[PDB]
């Protein structure tokens, strides 16, 4: 038996206890799971645009209260009259106001300038903040697509445009979509694609802190795995200073003299703040950087106070005490509170009495009482997420900043206790045995008081290892505009010239995993931080030096094309193998797959360079029985290297023997299968040579069709002006003599046999004998394009006959690449050691459809890991969707704070028929459609609206799309379908269709 009830009722007790230990840590994660503050974006009064430039305002004691905005078309003359009760006048003669809420980047997001004109400056800045708070957490803002990620913005209605009843001229249907705190949380969750609860909060001076409360509990419960809490009060009208002044509450200076005897009113400021909140478990499991940790947030109302405006004492204590209880802390656990400190001669006394009650009553050390509004002004609904950022910087800098205008501690408050030390000098706040905790209070004008507790981030980040590597990881940067590309290279040179010594692998991991892939890319593989800040000083002007630049919208899947003979050099793979674990492993694998059939092990033949490959009656890998197996060894290893750094194929195109690598990498044949196949095709092809030869020439193919003869006929169409012809020595040498005198140079390939002709079938006997049926054709892993039928086909036809057939008929490489272009793909990596025929598919793209992208791996006499970092550079820059979590899968790379996107801001402020002559008609309708587009898009500068950008990324929503189709149905007088904007996503496509609808 089981030791009756001694080893049983005690075996059920280690479950009923170990289930109680896991059903009680679910209750401590449903109520008090500490949420992280993964990133912080802020646009605050003064020059503040980053949470780092705010620490240069909070640490050197600068007040951002400068003056009223002149950008915004505010009267500024009726706002000020000696009569303090004149309707329409304001009482504060300044305040910390944003100098950049007037400007915005519309084309960056899916917004038309006309729609971005109607967008409230509250949401317009929240869009740029939502991007910053994601680019600052190392989260690509486009990777958060269809993801559970709440957006909790806290705003105030205010008044921006023209009263909706009267509408507008260009802003007619978008006026509503601009003046609505409703879409001021949904607009953000639409542009980024977030599928989390996007709620807007209205509690006035507590909106932000109440929004972090709602976000904290959407992470405690789990409704959203990520949240962007945050509040904005950009005031586009002086209405608030005119109505906050009729109650006589604004400070005549606009300064929030927090807890000071000279408080002559509450003052004001405009601003915005956003926090990326994630529960600590998820934040540290996914690797997201934790700055500080929101532990407990409480939200209460003042109740029946002395009016709707006047604060309440007991209610404030009940939320400063509910936050501590809900976080599991005590009054003595908090080291520095960041009180509201609104600035009113009434609010501050009751507020401090509340802080002397919830903390000061039981204090061991004096509470460091502060207020961000002293340095900034009352940012209203941005106050609370300005205070959480000032506390999260105070912890992240080990200093608590000063509360400006607090030298004369208020006489109406009893500071005799000493339990509260008003921060008038920067008091050091160092990391120690106690976790550094703080508390941020926002008490709104609506009566709802909120108090949040912010612990320091648990210092478990330490423990990182160190190392060095030869991988020159591409520093990939990208922007939505060519000028944003030259300013994302200038704001990084500055960050790497003003934040010096940041490991180059750490700036390549952060720019790659943490920056969205935007449709203007630049990529360079640095070897130093002066060959990078010289490239980041040429990419700032536009000069592509040592880098790769490319406009690559609508490009996400690459194809692998496989060149034949041409890299006779074959002395660049040594370099890659020596520096690449993967190229020194895949090459070994394919060689040891080749040796069982062809004894030649490639690696010794590989250290042998061509400088060491011409003594014993030899040339630059002219032995077919030796070049073809080692060619394959290099090709499959290069294709495995490219797939090892994250680039996977979409289609496959193999010129002559690249078919065999089509077999291998696309899964249709194994390494042994394809190795045997090429090795066996090799020996057979090595018995014919001595009488045939291939002759690549740009020679007109509709002209060498008559030259077909003397046994020399076309073996491959490698582009429009690219023809590989194959035959014996009859026309072979006379081609060169009778051609090169008329600017047509015959590149007589250094080969000795003929393929894709009737010469291959002379070894049909041995080709079908020495291939065997053992490399059974298998449905593989990648689509593939046959260069014998010239068709996208199945991967189940690659057998012995298939190799014969491929070596029998014309390759038609040109037809294959054009079928690629028309099929849906547009980018092709010439996997090879030297990209021969590079400008051949570029030739294909120049005379047909759109120009194609010729990315290539190595070159003749270029095989270093530096040239492979440049290969990945030109691949990213040309559109190829490299995965950068594989190139940096392990290199000792850690996230580094980097400059966010350089939004190219322009002032967007809302104040209260052709008789078929020629293709000249094509470009004339093209221009007509563009002009009617950049008149329903509100592009006052009709000049240009990107031709490669879609009708869903230029803000061509209903209104724009419908009026556009109506403008075209009147100017061209046509009947465009209702869903035309969806039928033709591009202005190029729309213009082509309209000029094609002539009859």
């Amino acid at each position: 038996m089981a030791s009756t009830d001694s080893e049983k009722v005690a075996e059920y007790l280690r479950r009923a206890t170990l289930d109680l230990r896991a059903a009680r840590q679910r209750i401590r994660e449903l109520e008090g799971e500490p949420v992280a503050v993964v990133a912080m974006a802020c646009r605050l009064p003064g020059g503040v645009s980053t949470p780092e430039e705010f620490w240069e305002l909070l640490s050197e004691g600068r007040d951002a209260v400068a003056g009223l905005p002149t950008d915004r078309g505010w009267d500024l003359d009726s706002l000020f009259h000696p009569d303090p009760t004149r309707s329409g006048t304001a009482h504060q003669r300044g305040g910390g106001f944003l100098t950049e809420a007037t400007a915005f980047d519309p084309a960056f997001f899916g917004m038309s300038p006309r729609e971005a004109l109607a967008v409230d400056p509250q949401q317009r800045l929240m869009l740029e903040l939502s991007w910053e708070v994601l680019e600052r957490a190392g989260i690509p803002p486009t990777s958060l697509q269809a993801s559970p990620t709440g957006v909790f913005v806290g705003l105030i209605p205010q008044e921006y445009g023209p009263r909706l009843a009267e509408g507008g001229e260009g802003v007619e249907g978008y006026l509503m979509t601009g003046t609505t705190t409703s879409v001021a949380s949904g607009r953000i969750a639409y542009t980024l694609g977030l599928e989390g609860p996007a709620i807007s909060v209205d509690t006035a001076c507590s909106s932000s802190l109440v929004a972090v409360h709602l976000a904290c509990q959407s992470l405690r419960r789990g409704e959203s795995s990520l949240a962007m809490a945050g509040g904005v009060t950009v005031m586009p009208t002086p209405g608030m200073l005119v109505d906050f002044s009729r109650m006589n509450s604004l400070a005549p200076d606009g300064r929030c003299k927090a807890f000071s005897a000279g408080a002559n009113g509450f003052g004001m400021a405009e601003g915005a703040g956003m926090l990326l909140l994630e529960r600590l478990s998820d934040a540290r499991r996914n690797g997201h950087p934790v700055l500080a940790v929101l532990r407990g947030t409480a939200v209460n109302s003042d109740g029946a106070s002395n009016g709707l405006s006047a604060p309440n004492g007991r209610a404030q204590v009940r939320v400063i005490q509910q936050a501590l209880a809900e976080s599991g802390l005590g009054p003595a656990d908090i080291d520095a509170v960041e009180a509201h400190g609104t600035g009113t001669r009434l609010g501050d006394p009751i507020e401090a009495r509340a802080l002397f009650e919830a903390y000061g009553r039981d204090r061991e050390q004096p509470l460091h009482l502060g207020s961000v509004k002293s340095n900034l002004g009352h940012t209203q609904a941005a106050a609370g997420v300005a205070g959480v950022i000032k506390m999260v910087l105070a912890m992240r800098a080990g200093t608590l900043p000063r509360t400006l205008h607090a030298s004369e501690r208020s006489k109406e408050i009893d500071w005799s206790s000493g339990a509260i030390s008003l921060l008038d000098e920067p008091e050091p706040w160092p990391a120690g045995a106690r976790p550094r905790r703080a508390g941020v209070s926002s008490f709104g004008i609506s009566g709802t008081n909120a108090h949040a507790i912010i612990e320091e981030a648990p210092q478990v980040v330490e423990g990182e290892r160190v190392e060095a590597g030869d991988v020159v990881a591409p520093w990939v940067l990208s922007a939505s505009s060519a000028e944003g590309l030259r300013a994302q290279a200038a704001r990084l040179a500055a960050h790497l010239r003003e934040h010096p010594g940041q490991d180059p692998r750490d700036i390549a991991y952060s720019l790659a995993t943490g920056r969205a892939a935007l449709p203007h890319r630049a990529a360079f593989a640095p070897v130093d931080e002066s060959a990078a800040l010289r490239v980041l000083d040429g990419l700032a002007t536009g000069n592509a030096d040592g880098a790769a630049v490319g406009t690559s919208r609508a490009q996400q899947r690459a194809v692998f094309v496989f060149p034949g003979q041409g890299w006779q050099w074959a002395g660049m793979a040594v370099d890659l193998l020596d520096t690449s674990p993967v190229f020194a492993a895949a090459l070994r694998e394919c060689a040891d797959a080749l040796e069982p059939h062809l004894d030649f092990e490639v690696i010794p033949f590989l250290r042998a360079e061509a400088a060491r490959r011409e003594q014993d009656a030899a040339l630059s890998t002219e032995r077919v029985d030796v070049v073809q197996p080692v060619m394959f060894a290099v090709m499959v290893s290069l294709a495995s290297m490219w797939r090892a750094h994250g680039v996977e194929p979409a289609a496959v195109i193999g010129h002559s023997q690249g078919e065999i690598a089509a077999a291998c990498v696309a899964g249709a044949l194994s390494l042994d299968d394809a190795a045997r196949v090429v090795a066996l095709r090799s020996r057979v092809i090595a018995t014919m040579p001595g009488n045939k030869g291939m002759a690549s020439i740009a020679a007109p193919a509709g002209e060498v069709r008559a030259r077909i003869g003397d046994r020399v006929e076309i073996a491959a169409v490698n582009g429009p002006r690219s023809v590989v012809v194959a035959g014996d020595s009859d026309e072979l040498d006379r081609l060169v003599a009778s051609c090169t005198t008329e600017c047509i140079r015959a590149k007589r390939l250094a080969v000795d046999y003929a393929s894709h002709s009737s010469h291959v079938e002379t070894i049909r006997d041995a080709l079908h004998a020495e291939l065997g049926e053992d490399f059974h054709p298998l449905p593989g892993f990648v689509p593939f394009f046959s260069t014998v039928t010239g068709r996208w086909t199945q991967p189940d036809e690659l057998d012995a006959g298939y190799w014969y057939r491929n070596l029998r008929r014309t390759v038609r490489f040109a037809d294959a690449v054009r079928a690629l272009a028309e099929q849906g793909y547009r980018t092709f990596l010439e996997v090879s050691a030297h990209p021969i025929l590079t400008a051949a598919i570029e030739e294909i793209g120049d005379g047909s459809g759109a120009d194609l992208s010729a990315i290539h791996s190595l070159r003749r006499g270029d095989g270093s890991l530096a040239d492979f970092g440049e290969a990945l550079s030109r691949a990213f820059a040309a559109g190829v969707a490299v995965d950068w979590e594989s190139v940096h899968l392990g290199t000792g790379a850690r996230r580094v704070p980097l400059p966010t996107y350089p939004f190219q801001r322009e002032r967007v402020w809302l104040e209260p028929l052709a008789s078929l002559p020629a293709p000249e008609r094509e470009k004339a309708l093209f221009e007509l459609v563009r002009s009617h587009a950049a008149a329903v898009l509100g592009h006052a500068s009709a000049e240009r609206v990107p031709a490669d950008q879609a009708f869903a990324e230029l803000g061509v929503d209903s209104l724009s799309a419908l009026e556009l189709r109506n403008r075209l149905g009147a100017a061209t007088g046509v009947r465009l379908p209702t869903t035309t904007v969806f039928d033709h996503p591009d202005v190029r496509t729309l213009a082509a269709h309209l000029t094609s609808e002539l009859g």
Partner: antibody, heavy 118, light 114 residues
Framework: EVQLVQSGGGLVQPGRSLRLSCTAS????????MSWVRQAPGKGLEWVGF??????????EYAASVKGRFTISRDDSKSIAYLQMNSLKTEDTAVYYC?????????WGQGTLVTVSS | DVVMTQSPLSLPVTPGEPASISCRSS???????????LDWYLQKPGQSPQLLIY???NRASGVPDRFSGSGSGTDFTLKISRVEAEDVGVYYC??????????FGPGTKVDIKR
């Protein structure tokens, strides 16, 4: 977090020996008497045996089908449970699994397709 | 003697519909403690067996709220209040009163119902 990853399956003949190892990481190995159960292909689970906790002492209770053939051990300092299978026969073609308990099989291994065919 | 436990061996379940596997023991599984010594295990198809319920009614952490347990040692009833594609497989009624236990029982062969 608890896990009971196994190792030691393979192909042998009736009358041979074989080792079954149960790597326990996540819990204090010495606390739970661990069992070894067996799923013959496509039929119900049959319990092979179990070794009692070292703290409890006790003994090693095996089945009637495998007494005198299989022996089960455990080590804390190396934290592995053993099913030593000896004198195998055609019946042992099955997916032996190692569960953390002797009366309450709370956690399980993925199962080792130990096969005994001639 | 030994406790012989039987069940509705071939119980069909249709998704979204509450189902109920039952167990019937020859002897009494309610031990002095006031605790039944019956356990409910799940071997989802081709996976490691899972512990759904211990001591008759208690549910094992990680097992969804769906698997409830109600009844007495003799006549038990595992009650799935919501059968999805995860509430399928073989449900073993496995006693604990007498251990040597050569078998886990025939097990309830659960199937998606049409």
């Amino acid at each position: 977090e608890v896990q009971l990853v196994q190792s030691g399956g393979g192909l042998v003949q009736p009358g041979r020996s074989l080792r079954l190892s149960c790597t326990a990481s996540g819990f204090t190995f010495g606390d739970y008497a661990m069992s070894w159960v067996r799923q013959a292909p496509g039929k119900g689970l049959e319990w092979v045996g179990f070794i009692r906790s070292k703290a409890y002492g006790g003994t090693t209770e095996y089945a009637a089908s495998v007494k005198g053939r299989f022996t089960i051990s455990r080590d804390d300092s190396k934290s592995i449970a053993y099913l030593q299978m000896n004198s195998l026969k055609t019946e042992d073609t099955a997916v032996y699994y190692c569960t953390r308990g002797g009366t309450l099989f709370d956690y399980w291994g993925q199962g080792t397709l130990v096969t005994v065919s001639s | 003697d030994v406790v012989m436990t039987q069940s509705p061996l071939s119980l069909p379940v249709t998704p979204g519909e509450p189902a109920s596997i039952s167990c019937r023991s020859s002897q009494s599984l309610l031990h002095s403690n006031g605790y039944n010594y019956l356990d409910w295990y799940l071997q989802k198809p081709g996976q490691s067996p899972q512990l759904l319920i211990y001591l008759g009614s208690n549910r094992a952490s990680g097992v969804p709220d769906r698997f409830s347990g109600s009844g007495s040692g003799t006549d038990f009833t595992l009650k799935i209040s919501r059968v999805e594609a995860e509430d399928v497989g073989v449900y073993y009624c496995m006693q604990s009163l007498q251990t040597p236990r050569l078998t886990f029982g025939p097990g309830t062969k659960v199937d998606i119902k049409r």
